[PDB]
């Protein structure tokens, strides 16, 4: 007659218990679907990224309107070079053919808990940039961010 | 009818965000294509090369017109011998068959952050010189710059 | 457009002060 | 039938004895549960804290209603700087941008048995203050209280 479709929460399944009650809240557990990247520890939490991005802008004294153009070069620089640079060093982003130097102290010192996890936010755009140039000319990099 | 060509910046791709806004400036990110050697940390930045080249010319007291001929010998000397020489030593470049001695103190002391990265500028011409002689006589070297 | 070149004397840097003046 | 549950006070366990009787009072020993911080010697006893707090308020001649606002600055000052300051010195707490100086003689002289143990009372709020600011801006300190 009717085909028995099995349920996801079987009756004979041990929900965790504490003093009789259940520690879980299995009516909204099914209505709880976060993205695999927004609850992963491989990326720094948005609060810690809002601090690194704000503690770097103050060290450079760059205005909020001129701030984002700097972050284009920072990712591109972090593509050839790894996310473990010299804290007593500088990174370069060009105004055409002229090199512009930026200190690496606020970048590494203010990145918590690790510069790798702070730079992991740029991972989505890093692939979108490497592949975009590979169409024109080879851009086989040395490290990643 | 029309074939759907995919875009590089997909709609469902996580641009990094800070307080709602976007840290990147993805309208000039695509119009930003620097050379892989001018934003790499394996070579000293042009400002630091403009300092080493100017702090060495003063120690030798060599005029700006006689200065570049010295740099021919320095690279050739740095081909057989590595970029980590004795600071209390000399390097040689010939006026034909007669040896001419130059101190190695301004070369190593004034090279920041490392003599290897300062000498990495000569990498393009180093290959163009080794291969040019290999046509005439073997020039299998011992180190590089 | 234009690359922001940082200055040596940042605005948020504590110049020594004496009775208001520097 | 019935599962034998073991007792905490086993019959074959040597209660300390003195002249036949028992030195312990093992009927209220089980009904005696103090906090691990209120019987620990790492913090000065409340009687000695009631003396230091009262012997400092008299030296500053500060009223009891204006007294507690001073203790906010004292802990914050004791976060960057350790609990072993110069007795012939002063500590600072701001009325906005204007420094206010307070002598360090009543703070150190009247703290028994050690200023570290007297300042150990503020340990619970010290973490609650460092973490609260770390959300806004980095507050990586140098010592603790």
Author numbering:
A (entry chain Aa), B (entry chain Ab), D (entry chain Ai): 42 to 186
C (entry chain Ah): 42 to 63
Sentences from the paper on this structure:
Potyviral CP plays a role in virtually every step of the viral infection cycle, from transmission of the virion by aphids, virus assembly and disassembly, regulation of genome amplification, protein translation, to cell-to-cell and long-distance movement. CP consists of a highly conserved globular core flanked by two large extended regions with a high frequency of structural disorder. The C-terminal high intrinsic disorder region (C-IDR) is partially conserved and packaged in the lumen of the virion, supported by the helical ssRNA scaffold. Here, we show that we can control the shape, size, RNA encapsidation ability, symmetry, stability and surface functionalization of nanoparticles through structure-based design of CP from potato virus Y (PVY).
Because we found that 19 C-terminal residues of this construct, including those of the α7-helix, were not defined by cryo-EM density, we prepared another deletion mutant, CPΔC79, excluding these residues. The VLPΔC79:h filaments had a similar structure to VLPΔC60:h, but a better-defined C-terminal part. On the other hand, the fold of the N-IDR in CPΔC60/CPΔC79 resembled that found in RNA-encapsidating filaments, consistent with the CP-CP distances along the VLPΔC79:h filament being closer to VLPh+RNA than to VLPh. Thus, disruption of the RNA-binding cleft by large truncation of the C-terminal part of CP prevents RNA binding and also leads to the formation of monomorphic VLPs. VLPΔC79:h filaments are compact flexible hollow nanotubes with an inner channel diameter of 5.4 nm, with thermal stability higher than that of wild type VLPs and comparable to that of PVY virions.
